[PDB]
């Protein structure tokens, strides 16, 4: 597994000249007024990923944000509102073309209430996906390894979740749930995060 | 209070050239696929309303119809999310451009957790207002007078909801809800009526 | 209002030739083993009612145990399931011929969560039913005229309800539900009082 | 283990013409509406089993279909409730001679809490019973040893649980529960699968 | 209504030399380590009481204790398990001869959920029982005539509840529970205020 | 270990001149009105017991009957309670002379909320204690091993816990709730079993 | 009723050369991120008050923060948590020298569960207390009485509460929680406002 | 390990001439006013611990004592809300120079909802942390390493949250929760102890 690791930025986006990205980050915890982005991890789907280490007070990162503003560009998370929320926080750009396999599995795993991505990867690929303090200077292997994982795996999930959206015909409900789910997030930014919008009560 | 009752369908659209219209419905119950619907209330917002008796088994209502497809006139609401359902359900066209009054409280209402009609039209414009089977052949004149109340208000509270929207600069926010709510619908429709889309769990 | 009290028993069935009777109890409380029977109110529809003091360790009631046997006279409660096993712990027969404006009220009146007797008379009858030792060797006034309350409207009831169930098609299902009551009374007698045997868990 | 794998349908009743049948399903989910019946899985008894692949959108299945219509044979289930709804949805016929382990363990094994298949095998017939896309075009010899395996035992366990009904003096209340589990499914497909229609509230 | 006010302690017996007294207590709270005993409220059945202003720091009042201890005056209490363990914790003497009427009330009047001194009296006798500083120097006239009120109908409801005990055969029952209240009550005193002490868990 | 299994009744009391017996039983379920009593196990405390199956209908069982009635004897139980129950409604003898190990546990063991029997065993006594139809006209070797494993440590329990008792200076409590354990099991067969009865609601 | 209303700020300090101030607030909403602050109203105790619109975006009330850095000058709240929070989010100062009246309830009234203003001011000073667009442009009289009405009577409340204090002698523990309350207050502002900090979970 | 067992107290303080001391206690229980102070660990950090058994009813301990007064010595605990209630109980003196690991915890490991001393231990320090009579007059050797294992760790878990707390900005919030901490211990002896003194209910 080759796993880049970087201080700030992608160095180019020689690797990245791709139509879908998979993406996930590390932070100190749920809250993202209070808790700050400590790593963003990118894959392009070739067995290898990206780790960037992002610093206290960090502001701007070129590279990683021109590839999440880039329209052309799909981004893929799994539960993609935190993450679009943390990195709309932390770099003031939000994505606003993405695919999440929560909402994926939600709309096609329907046999199961467990959607997780652990229990994603085991069911559809038959791989296993195995408390860190995210700040520290110097990451550990293991903590390397385990932030890697978390990528390495989306484009084909997303492969997969195309063909069951395909074969029950759900396929536009998702086209919209994706398309609102950065406004989901700046709801959460904005203070909604505990509420659902479209509830009676 | 001049409410004109009709069977089936207006007799035409002369009265709704306009470019926002207010739309309530009753019916036997809050699950589309068991209580069917039974009155569509609509207004033009001068004081005056259409009380309209669906009947059983009724699949076409053209002039209905062609307001309810019409992308040129919102579609008012409160709490569109059960409207737009049933009617989807009952003749098949799901509106695309409307307004709900319920989101558009949540998103200025901030002050307080009550977010029906009665406290709306209370604190808003001082607007009182006051187990019905709805399928009865002959509706009562007090099943007419509550039945017309529910329309005749809303747009008054659409002219003072876009002030406040536009106050704390939360239009994109309700804009993209809007959007949405139909797809919203069309997930209770299929099935997700329980289910929280958006939440991790 | 004719009330006619009697102790043990009806003196004769001179009233109650008839296709249908109006049935309640009182006693002691919920719980068949621990607390007696104490009264049972009966009705022909007629606007009177008989009001039959049970004393305690009775055991036999020919007149009343008659009544509830016979097979060509339908035994209409409001939620039967109580009234039926106090009445089999009692006189040691179950009726198998009845009709319950619960069950009913659940399968017609989908618009409302509100079941009792009192919604149910006052939504479609327009009549309004207004801690008592019931035991008493004499009964007031006042515990007269309650008791006879709970018997006086339910032939009008029951055949509001045979409309409904006959306009939403719905009268097989209400055919099989009480059929099937009795058995649920004796279920409850049995020890499964709190067990809904039908549920996955 | 003996399993024989069928597109559609038996191809004939050779193997059926006996007094009682082991009925399972397997499904895209819980909800009737909107998961698809997959698999339907049989077994008479002998020690092997049938395993038919229902098609999409399939509306017949005429040898099966007469299996479940016929009176002179009883269909044995776990939790009939599920099955019955889901299988009147999709071939529009409702089994009425049925047989479920579910209700038989609630009356008889009174001494636990735990009424699943799993553990009444385990108990009764100490025999071990060990997230999967029923809807796959080809399923895997683990998804269809484990569809067999809800089959193979039910004829046992009828057996057995007939014999502790006889000597708890139960049988009249089964034959009772029996009789109403076909209308508490159409209950289900009607609208009131999340009801208790018995309960005061 | 005479309503004798006195400081620290009845002046003598010469109105007590009866066979049951009717007492209750006020507190600064409901718990008896941190809220001291107030007011200490008796009546011998006459229409009269006597109210008893306890000080702050006081550790005798000997001729109530002298009531408290007489084993040949029964002690009548409405929910006891409170006011025996604030006067013994206050005065170290424990009375051992008791009458509760809220544990009367659970063992005869199983008809209602309602226990409180409230509606029993207004069900029994139809008497009708109308934050409050108990600590303050000078007790107003309101708090007097309350706290007088809290003791004039107990020696009526005790010989109602003794007519209904012996009706439904449950004085057994009745004097082993007034036999264990003192221990219950100094169980609260040592530390299982919040446990029930004969439940499985 | 020697277990002697009997038919209805122990042969004769030669093993039972002592001054307490280890009692414990099985029975079809946890409500004694509906599950009968199927198992009674007896210890002398001399590492054998006593297995003594309770035929359906029994009514008598004299020696034992001697023993539950001799006041000279302490009848030691885990969880008394349901014990006392089921034995006074089989046999009509409730026994008066008690000690309960989950009672002394409540009162000693106060630095955890786990009272089971295994965990007092495991804890007490460094003593591994390791679904079953007792009614079956056979018990085997695992269910006589396991019933009989229910008493043979009781008597070494009551030790520790007398010395606990004393040490804390709880002895008195424990007295008065073993005097009151017998009328709660009483209440419970009353039909009081799901209230307690000293609550203030 | 003097009701003296200002825009941005005080004009001057004339009317505040005193030891305690009465403080309140208005804003859109619970949470200081989001919902601004709109009024902030103080009292001298002489029954007049100040009621001070503050704008959007307003930075600055140089009058009133001198007022709130003033370590010579207490300022009372009732539930100061909330107040102080907004105060200090909005202008950049965290008063330190408090007294709160629902700490102080808290302390004192221990015979209640209602700490509420308006029922502390019914119980200690007879005083009857009686969804509001608070960031309207013009202020409607009712709510400028409202308004008002929250300050008029902290002063009053305050001496009563400082007598209990001493009497129940629990004026150091008071000390100690006003003390920590505006860390409190901040520990809200950093993210923790739904954690109580010293639970053990 | 070196672990010194010692009856009553300390022999002398040789080995506390330091400026913070690691402190635990082991009780008969959570509730102080029941359940007695059994033993007090101490370690100076430097792999050694004293484990002292408490005496019941002894009321000093100098050289303990002289140890918690001592105000240039901060004692450390995990979860000190209990230890401190509990040795304030025992001995009369409440120590003010404190530091807290669980509330360090929860200001710094916001990445986890797990803050107890295992799972703390575990992260921090990669040191494995493993109903029991603690009044027994000869603890066992099992035990007294348990008790050692509890204080042998907390001076390095200091030094950790001390570098979190700079790193992260919370130093003064800190400061400010641990010199509240005691008087959150004494509101618990004092009766508070289910009482979140600062929740608005």
Known sequence: ?????????????????????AV?????????HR???????????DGTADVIQ?????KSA???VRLLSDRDITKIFHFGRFDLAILAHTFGVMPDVVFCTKIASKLTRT????????????????????????????????QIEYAA????????????????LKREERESVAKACFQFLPMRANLDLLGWSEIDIFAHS
Request: aromatic share 6%.
């Open 1 to 21: 597994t080759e796993i880049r690791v970087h201080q700030g930025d992608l160095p180019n986006l020689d690797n990245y000249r791709i139509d879908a990205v």
């Open 24 to 32: 996930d980050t590390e932070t100190l915890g749920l809250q993202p």
């Open 35 to 45: 808790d700050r982005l400590c790593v963003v991890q990118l894959s392009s789907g």
């Open 54 to 58: 992002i610093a206290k007070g960090q």
């Open 62 to 64: 070129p590279n990683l």
């Open 111 to 142: 046999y199961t209430d467990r959607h997780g991505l652990k229990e994603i990867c085991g069911e559809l690929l038959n791989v296993n996906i195995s408390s860190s303090d995210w700040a520290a200077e110097t990451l550990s292997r293991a």
């Open 149 to 164: 994982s978390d990528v390495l795996y989306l484009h084909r999930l997303k492969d997969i979740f195309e063909e069951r």
